[PDB]
Design a protein around this ligand. Structure first.
Ligand SMILES: Nc1nc2c(ncn2[C@@H]2O[C@@H]3COP(=O)(O)O[C@H]4[C@@H](O)[C@H](n5cnc6c(=O)[nH]c(N)nc65)O[C@@H]4COP(=O)(O)O[C@H]3[C@H]2O)c(=O)[nH]1
Ligand SMILES: Nc1nc2c(ncn2[C@@H]2O[C@@H]3COP(=O)(O)O[C@H]4[C@@H](O)[C@H](n5cnc6c(=O)[nH]c(N)nc65)O[C@@H]4COP(=O)(O)O[C@H]3[C@H]2O)c(=O)[nH]1
Ligand SMILES: Nc1nc2c(ncn2[C@@H]2O[C@@H]3COP(=O)(O)O[C@H]4[C@@H](O)[C@H](n5cnc6c(=O)[nH]c(N)nc65)O[C@@H]4COP(=O)(O)O[C@H]3[C@H]2O)c(=O)[nH]1
Ligand SMILES: Nc1nc2c(ncn2[C@@H]2O[C@@H]3COP(=O)(O)O[C@H]4[C@@H](O)[C@H](n5cnc6c(=O)[nH]c(N)nc65)O[C@@H]4COP(=O)(O)O[C@H]3[C@H]2O)c(=O)[nH]1
Ligand SMILES: Nc1nc2c(ncn2[C@@H]2O[C@H](COP(=O)(O)OP(=O)(O)O)[C@@H](OP(=O)(O)OP(=O)(O)O)[C@H]2O)c(=O)[nH]1
Ligand SMILES: Nc1nc2c(ncn2[C@@H]2O[C@H](COP(=O)(O)OP(=O)(O)O)[C@@H](OP(=O)(O)OP(=O)(O)O)[C@H]2O)c(=O)[nH]1
Ligand SMILES: [Mg+2]
Ligand SMILES: [Mg+2]
Ligand SMILES: [Mg+2]
Ligand SMILES: [Mg+2]
Lengths: 439, 447
């Protein structure tokens, strides 16, 4: 993940760059507003860490200008404030900040925030891609406060009561049940007295029903060990006590919006028919699945290595099957054909349904010479045995034409590889039927 | 998660029980074979940790008998072996063990194995539920063999040995360059075996790069680690490797861990690509965009259980559109579908996002309102009726206008022994009485 760090003092920038690079992050740096705005639009980073106090262009202005640009509006921005930054955080939210860090930088809080917002960036990126080809803000959620400190829980619920729908639970047993219902966020007190909030959190993560339910832990800043333990158990992010209203607002909004993005992408859009990856008739994968996998396969082959082979199989005279036996028997033949095809090719290969009665087999780490002999093996297994249909009442023979291609070259592309296999099929169809042709 | 620990010596059992309970596990104990087999069938634990050497019935026999019983065959079994336990691991795999631990027990290795196998147990449980449902209602590769395994290592002698060990049951591929490996890992790869102690690249940096990209974020990864360097082991597990392999690589350990990761992946992919996209397991109505009855039932179960324990009740609204056939008759089925889409938008806009406006039937909708009393639920239904009936529905790309009315039945969960079925049955009565006494009305039924 790529992080942009912005601070007027070079020593602050180098210190953060060293810490983040040690944790396997790709870090760029800027030391004033104009350069940071130019870098963000040019490089399009994943997260921006931004100091609020800089000469000339303050961080608030940089944040506002990042949200004005439509190409950088989606990039999470973290504002680094000072100890007493209540006013800064208030103006930070108005400027459009995602969350906050306070200096001097606490390493646990630093990486906790980065890890949370990088995961959010992943769903942000995915949602934008699908939108290019439903409540999606972070407000109005049911937030479950699990805490035995009444004064604290009531204060948290009051702060959350204007933007969300808060609910308090002192008993952990009742909280487990409520947490299994329509709950958007759980705020648990790590420093609880009558129950182990960390044990409670671990119970949530063990059950599949609640394994991905967002959890925020209220932690004591003196006890660093409990902070690390909570993050290890699987808490999404932590809130230092006493609870800051602006930090509470930001962190809750991030978790609820991340949840809604994920559920919308997985429950609605993934189950839609335009984005499906498996053919319902044959049970094989479709072209959408194949294209994604073939992209990486061809890219690796172009760098020098074992090539990728492609088999395009087309059933000969499939109309006649539908005309003589009916469309339902035709569907029986396609299902039985798909079973035979997958059974006689490696599970590491990609036998997919390419067209209506056309199939594709992508064979990684395979050369053209072998692919031609493999196509011959496939043809003999599907054409050598008859297809029994109509609950055993009818027997039918089938023949197929195959076109074969392999990825040889530095600038080869998935489209060129398949276009070369198409020609194989068209030439195999022209010169009779039941043949293999390699181009 | 519930773990069963089996050892003949009590001190060994208490030591493991203490370590595991400290990590928030529910631990049961047995001190001989017969007792462990009886406990396993009765309690059905999630993981069994089993000593190989016990008087009378050894661990190997217990493992074999666990796999013979069809009710416990699915429970992963970990065998605790000795130092030179090559024979133990060979005989363990023959007995049907899932994986192994070596004594003296290493806490890092202990929790790595348990965490790995508990996640596998989750998918196992889900697959078995779906298979139970399919049996009541009346062909993919689900073993752990034959996978494409990507070995990312610059040590030639090690990589060649690993590839040879994997070359009999799987399809191994070696990659020295981490850049080329990053690309291959995004294709049809079932497992990545990376060398944490590499010389020309940081295998742990490589692993973190895999986890950062969405394409490869859940790709199973095994890390080959040095047992001397405890810090690197913990760091690899923190980065997100699925499990670790101690060097030099044990053939039986390599076989076990690879099978576990590959089978877990195939279970997950089958459950998410095939079965989740089927109509029996969907949770969102594709037409209206609301959730459906399957989703509602799951959520309502927890909601009612909490209400029965004493607290704010749960209310239920059943909305049925009046004279929907006439819409289909006059304007056609496609305009009818437009009305349903527009109705769902109005319904969701006029209830809280914490509420559950779902498509209950064909033209029947349900609104589950948690922490809500009957008196308020009745006034909310009145709000809904006025918003749907007060404004006409624009259909046919703006060319046609239509009026719609709805009948609503309202109920709330009052009582300790109330059930979701009774709650909805009381709302059904409301709807049926609202239909009988004219249309465009709301009727409430209290217990
Ligand atoms: N992606 C893909 N490539 C294929 C397939 N069939 C053959 N090839 C490629 O062609 C090479 C020669 O395979 P073979 O002549 O049939 O001679 C093979 C074959 O007789 C046998 N073999 C390997 N795997 C299998 C298998 O899964 N089933 C059977 N019956 N024999 C296998 O071992 C011989 C050597 O195999 P390899 O060294 O791996 O090298 C193989 C492989 O790279 C396939 O179905 N899918
Ligand atoms: N002539 C030839 N045919 C190939 C080859 N590779 C795959 N096939 C064909 O495709 C079938 C499925 O192989 P698989 O899916 O990888 O699933 C295979 C594979 O996982 C394993 N297997 C069999 N032989 C070998 C082998 O030589 N090396 C490895 N690594 N696995 C093998 O057993 C499974 C069942 O294999 P089969 O029953 O024989 O049935 C095989 C075989 O008919 C090949 O290289 N040459
Ligand atoms: N699950 C669910 N329950 C509902 C709904 N509408 C009303 N209630 C329940 O009935 C209580 C009274 O709501 P009200 O009479 O309109 O009197 C309300 C209302 O005037 C206002 N209010 C709260 N949230 C909203 C809102 O989202 N939009 C508007 N326009 N007013 C709201 O604050 C008053 C007190 O509300 P509450 O304290 O929360 O206590 C509410 C709430 O518990 C609903 O749509 N869904
Ligand atoms: N914590 C809190 N948030 C508030 C309040 N007032 C408005 N909001 C927030 O602002 C969103 C829009 O509410 P609305 O425009 O009045 O339009 C609302 C309103 O028309 C109706 N509604 C929801 N609750 C109530 C209620 O309690 N009383 C009445 N009369 N209507 C409600 O449903 C619409 C959607 O409400 P939501 O889905 O939850 O989405 C609401 C909610 O997130 C409040 O008093 N307390
Ligand atoms: N039973 C069945 N047949 C399929 C399916 N997909 C395509 N068909 C059909 O395959 C037939 C084409 O077969 P070929 O005759 O070999 O086509 P080709 O010239 O390109 O090689 C078309 O006949 P058709 O009579 O026009 O079929 P249809 O239009 O009624 O679906 C086409 O509609 C399918 O999923 N199930
Ligand atoms: N456009 C559309 N209409 C739906 C859908 N689901 C149900 N309908 C309607 O639900 C109706 C069932 O009758 P009710 O709606 O309960 O009786 P009512 O009109 O008095 O309230 C179906 O009657 P039907 O006319 O006999 O069935 P149909 O021929 O319209 O499909 C059907 O019109 C849907 O998904 N899309
Ligand atoms: Mg400054
Ligand atoms: Mg054809
Ligand atoms: Mg012993
Ligand atoms: Mg109706």
């Amino acid at each position: 993940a790529r992080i942009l760090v912005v601070d007027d003092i070079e020593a602050n920038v180098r210190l953060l760059e060293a810490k983040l690079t040690a944790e396997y992050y790709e870090v760029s740096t800027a030391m004033d507003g104009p350069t940071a705005l130019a870098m963000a639009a040019r490089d399009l980073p994943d997260i921006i860490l931004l100091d609020v106090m800089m000469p000339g262009m303050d961080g608030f202005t940089v944040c506002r200008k990042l949200k004005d640009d439509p190409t950088t509006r989606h990039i999470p921005v973290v504002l680094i404030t000072a100890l007493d930054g209540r006013g800064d955080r208030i103006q930070g939210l108005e400027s459009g900040a995602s969350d906050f860090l306070t200096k001097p930088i606490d390493d646990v809080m630093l990486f906790a925030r980065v890890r949370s917002l990088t995961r959010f960036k992943l769903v942000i990126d995915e949602l934008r891609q699908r939108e290019a080809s439903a409540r999606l803000d972070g407000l109005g959620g049911r937030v479950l406060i699990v805490d035995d400190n009444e004064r604290q829980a009531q204060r948290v619920a009051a702060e959350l009561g204007v933007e969300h729908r808060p609910v308090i639970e002192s008993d952990p047993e009742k909280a487990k049940i409520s947490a299994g219902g329509p709950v958007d966020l759980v705020i648990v007190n790590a420093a609880a007295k009558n129950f182990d909030g960390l044990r409670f959190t671990a119970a949530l993560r063990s059950e599949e029903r609640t394994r991905q339910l967002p959890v925020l832990a209220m932690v004591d800043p003196d006890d660093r060990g409990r902070m690390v333990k909570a993050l290890e158990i699987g808490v999404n992010d932590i809130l230092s006590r006493p609870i800051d209203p602006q930090e509470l607002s930001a962190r809750v909004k991030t978790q609820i919006q991340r949840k809604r993005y994920t559920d919308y992408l997985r429950n609605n859009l993934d189950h839609s028919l335009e984005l499906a990856v498996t053919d319902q008739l044959t049970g094989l994968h479709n072209r959408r699945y194949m294209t994604g996998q073939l992209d990486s396969l061809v890219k690796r082959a172009t760098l020098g290595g074992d090539p990728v082979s492609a088999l395009l199989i087309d059933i000969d005279f499939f109309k006649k099957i539908n005309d003589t036996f009916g469309h339902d028997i035709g569907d029986e033949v396609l299902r039985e054909f798909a079973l035979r095809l997958a059974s006689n090719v490696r599970a590491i290969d990609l036998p997919c349904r390419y067209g209506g009665e056309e199939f594709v087999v992508i064979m990684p780490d395979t050369a053209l010479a072998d692919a031609l002999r493999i196509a011959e093996r496939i043809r003999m297994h599907v054409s050598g045995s008859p297809f029994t249909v109509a609950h055993g009442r009818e027997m039918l023979n089938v023949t197929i034409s195959i076109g074969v291609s392999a990825t040889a070259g530095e600038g080869d592309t998935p489209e060129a590889l398949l276009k070369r296999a198409d020609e194989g099929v068209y030439q195999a169809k022209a010169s009779g039927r039941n043949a293999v042709v390699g181009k």
